[model samples]
Target: NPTYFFTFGDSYSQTGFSASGTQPSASNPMGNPDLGIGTTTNGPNWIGYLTTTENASLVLSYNLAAGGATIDNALVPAYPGDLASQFRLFEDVYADKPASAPWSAEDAVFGVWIGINDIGNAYYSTDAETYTPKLISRLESLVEEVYKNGGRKFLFLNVPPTSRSPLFLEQGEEVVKQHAEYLSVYNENLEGMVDDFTKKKGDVTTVLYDSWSFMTKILDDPTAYGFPDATCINDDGTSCIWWNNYAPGMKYHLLQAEDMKPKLRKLGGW
Candidate 1:
C-alpha cells in the first residue's frame, strides 16, 4: 500500500537533477556529457527500479537527492540544503493534506542514500578522520528524525569504496590500499550504527543496502559488469578519459534497475 517513496542523498540517488550540461564536473559525476544522460533513460540507477517495482505513483516519487551533498550538510547550511531540509519539505507536502489522508506511515516508504559525499569530501580535503564521527552522528540523527515524523520503513544505503574511483587510480598501490582500509572502517561503523538503531527502535524498520560490495564486484571484474574498457581511464595520460570521472557504462550495469529487486523484496516492511 506504499504511496509515497521519498529519496534523499547525493549523486547515487540522483535522477536527472545533475544531468549532462547542467552541474559542474567536480561535483556532478552523472552530469558529465561523456556519461551520456543518466539513470533516466538507462535501466540502471536503483531508484528507478525501486519506484517501479513498488508501483509508485510518479507524483509521489519525490527525489530530493543532490550532487556533492553530505550528511554534514543537514546540520550546517551547506549545498542548498540536506536531508533535514528535504524532510521539512516533505512535512509541508503532507501538511497540505487532511489528517484522515490514506497516505500515512503504513503507505509510505523513505529511501536514504547519503554518506558517500561526506567521505569523498573528507578524502579530497585530507580530513577523513575528522569527518567520520560527523557522518555517523548525522546518520543517527536522520533516522531519529524520520521516525519522529511517523516514518516506519527506512531503506539506508552504504557508501561505495572511493578507492576504486579514477581519482585514486593515479595514486600508488599503497595509497589505494589505505583508501580501501579507510572505506572499510567507515562502512563498518555505518553497519554498527544501523544495528544499534534497530535495536533501540523496534517500530522503525530499517534495511542496509551494501553499495560497497556491488562497486567492488564491478571493480574486480569490469568486463563481466559490461564495462566498455578495462580501465576507467582513457588513452590520454593527462585527464580522465570519461567526461566527468566515471565509467558510465559500468556504473549503469552494476547499479541496474533489475539488480535491486531481490534486495528490496528481502528488505520489505512498509
Candidate 2:
C-alpha cells in the first residue's frame, strides 16, 4: 500500500485542492493547479515540498487545507472552510477509502498547520485570554474526531511569529508586542494540548513541529538561507524571505519540509 497524507490547515498549508479537482498520479503529484499555482507562496508550500521532493516512498497527498481556516468559527470567524468543514469533507469523500486514494490506518498520516489566522484575528479581542483555550479545546476535539476515523499517525505545525511579518509590523511597535505575547500563549497551549492528546490516545503517534522557532531562525539570519532580506516582500521568492506581506516565500517552505522529513518518516509519513 502507498503512504497517504491527508493535510488540514490554513493558507500556509493549502494547495487549493477540491474533491473534484485533478487527482494525484505519478505524472502530477499535487493533483491541482500545476506546481504552485494555488499556494500562498509563489511556489510550492511545505506540504508541496514534502509530497513531491521529501518523500521516502510513493505518497498520495490529499491537501484539504483552505486559505483562511480557523480552528472554530464560534471563537473567530473564518473563511468558508474551517477545520470542522475540512473534516466533514474528508468524511464525505475519503472516509470510505475510495479506490483512487485508498488508505488504511497504518498507511495514512494526518497533518494540521492551523492557528495562524486564529491568533491573528483574535489575539487582541476583548475575550482573547478566555477564548484561546476554547479555541484549543475545539482543535483538540477535531483531532479526536480524526482519531475516531482511524487516523493514528498525526503531524501538527504550530503558529509562527506573525507579529514579525510585514503585515503585522505595519501596525506599530505596541501592536507587534501585544501580538507576540498572545502568539506565545497560543503555542504554549498547543504544545500542552498535543502532549495530553498523545497520552489520552495511547495508540496514536503525533509530532508537533516548532514552526515558531523555525521561522524565527530564518528571520534572524536570512543570508544563511540564501535570502537577500528577511523583511522584504518578494513574490518571485528569490530576494526575500516573504512571498508577500503575509506569507513566507517558497524557500522557507522547502527548508521547513527538509527539516521535518526525518521526523515524519518515523511516524510512517514518508
Candidate 3:
C-alpha cells in the first residue's frame, strides 16, 4: 500500500503560494476570488486529487512545494529552505515509526517540479550561460540526495516554455524568440540528465513530464484549445483575468492540467 506522497519543487506544483493573499496581477488572475491559491475553491489541485483517489489508498499527501523555489534553493541560500530541508522533514516524520512499519520505495512517491524560476529569474537578473550549468548541477545534486534516501520513483517535471506566457508576449517577438531558444537548451540538458539517471539507477522509475510541449501547444493555437485571445495578454497589460504581472488568463490553460493528471496517476502506481 502507498504510505505517502511527498512533493518538492516550486510554484507550478504549488496549490496556492503564488496566488495567495494578493489581488489580480499578471501572474495571479484568480487570486482575488481565492480561486488561484489555496484549496478553498474546491477545485482540487493536481496533487490533492492524486492523493485522494481510490487508487491512492493509504497515501497521505504532503505538499512542500513553494513558489519561486528552484534546484539552487535545494543547496545554496537561494530560498529559506530547499528540497534538502523537505527530505529532512520526511526523515523526521518517519523516524519514530516502528521498523516493521518502515517506509519503502514502493510505499512512497515523489514529485519534483522546479527550475523554471531559476531560468526566469536568471533572464530577469543574470545571463543565460551562467544559469544553465548551475541549474543542471543543482538538479543533479537533488536527485543524488533522493537516491541516497532510497527514493526510487520520481516524477521530475521539465520547465515550461515561459516565452509563451502573456508576460513574455508583451516583450515582443524578438525577445520571445530568444527566450524560447534559451529555454529549449535548458530543457535539452534536463532530458539528458534524466536519461543518465535512469541508466545509472536501474531500479528507479524516473519520468520527465514535458511541460514545454503543453505550453507550446497552448501558445501556438490558443483558440483550438478553448483559450481566448485574452488568454494571452494585450500590450496594455490586460487579460481575461489579471494575475499581477505574469499572465492573468493562465489559470485557464488546459494543457497544464491535462499534463499533470497522468503523472499524478503514476505516482499512485495506477
Q: Give the number of the best model, judged by lDDT.
A: 2
Winner by TM-score: 2
Scored by lDDT, model 1 comes in at: 0.57
Candidate 1: where are CA atoms >4 Å away? 16-44, 53-60, 74-78, 95-102, 124-131, 171-174, 233-243, 246-256, 266-270
Candidate 2, residues 7-96, lDDT tens digits: the string is 999989888897898988767778886767789888889988998899887777889999889887777887889988998899999888
Select the stronger candidate by TM-score from 1 and 3: 1
Output the better candidate (1/2) by TM-score: 2
Query: How do the residues 1-270 of candidate 1 rate in per-residue lDDT, one tens digit apiece?
Result: 335556787665566542113432223322323332344223334564455433323213456676656776544335765666656655665423444223467656678877665565565445445566667877788667767778777777787766666666677677767777666777888888888888888776677888778767766776675565435554231122222354333244334445555666534421
Candidate 3: what lDDT? 0.59
lDDT by residue (1-270, candidate 3, tens digit) is: 545556777655556532123422223322333333353212444454444433334555556666566565533345654656555555565423334235567766677877666666565454556567677877787678767777787877787776766667788988777777777777888888889988988898777888778766656675665556534443222233223345323343333555566665655544
Question: Arrange candidates by lDDT, highest first: which order?
Answer: 2, 3, 1
TM-score versus the correct structure, for each prediction: 0.73, 0.96, 0.73
Model 2, backbone clash pairs (residues 3+ apart or across chains), number: 0
Please list the residue runs of candidate 2 whose C-alpha ends up more than 4 Å from where it truly belongs after superposition. Answer: 127-129
Model 3, TM vs. native: 0.73
